[PDB]
């Protein structure tokens, strides 16, 4: 029952972005909205003293592939994009993503091997977990950042290009 506060709060950050949007012809909505959910997940799962430990690692592996599809979707997003302005920020964002979700699962193995033992100290516990929930805000506020310049991005979409992703706000009606 005990849940982990800032990366609940992370979660609902990523969230409440991810939720203006359909998912509707929109995957980058529909990955961003599964990290989330599975980042929520991560948040009873460092709080939670048992049973954790397979979890836990399961969770960053569910989220690290949600973020390489967010990565690898944007990434085409900044190759049809006609600003040059906009291009560069998209794709930056979208570079660092994959190091984040890779340093997520290696602070999730790291915090799951060291949990229930008493070996290690409070202070080291604490610091694990500390290190763990940094790495969270982090990739919540990179994708969060790459789904609002994404958006952005697709206005000036190439004339006529491909097929687009479908920017549909849900808060009105």
């Given at each position: 029952q005990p849940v982990n506060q800032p990366i609940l709060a992370a979660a609902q950050s990523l969230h409440w972005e991810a939720t203006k949007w359909s998912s509707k012809g929109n995957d980058i909505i529909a990955a961003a909205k599964r990290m989330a959910l599975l980042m929520a997940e991560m948040s009873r799962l460092v709080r939670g003293g048992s049973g954790t430990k397979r979890a836990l690692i399961q969770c960053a592996k569910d989220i690290a592939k949600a973020s390489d599809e967010v990565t690898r979707l944007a990434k085409e997003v900044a190759k049809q994009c006609t600003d040059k302005r906009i291009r560069t920020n998209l794709l930056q964002?979208?570079?660092?993503i994959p190091?984040?979700?890779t340093q997520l699962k290696i602070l999730?193995?790291?915090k799951a091997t060291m949990l229930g033992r008493t070996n290690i100290s409070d202070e080291e516990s604490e610091q694990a977990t500390e290190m763990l929930v940094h790495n969270a805000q982090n990739l919540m506020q990179s994708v969060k950042e790459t789904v609002r310049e994404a958006e952005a991005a697709s206005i000036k979409i190439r004339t006529d290009?491909?097929?687009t992703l479908r920017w549909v706000r849900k808060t009105p009606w």
């Open positions: 964002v979208c570079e660092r190091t984040i979700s999730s193995t790291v290009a491909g097929f």
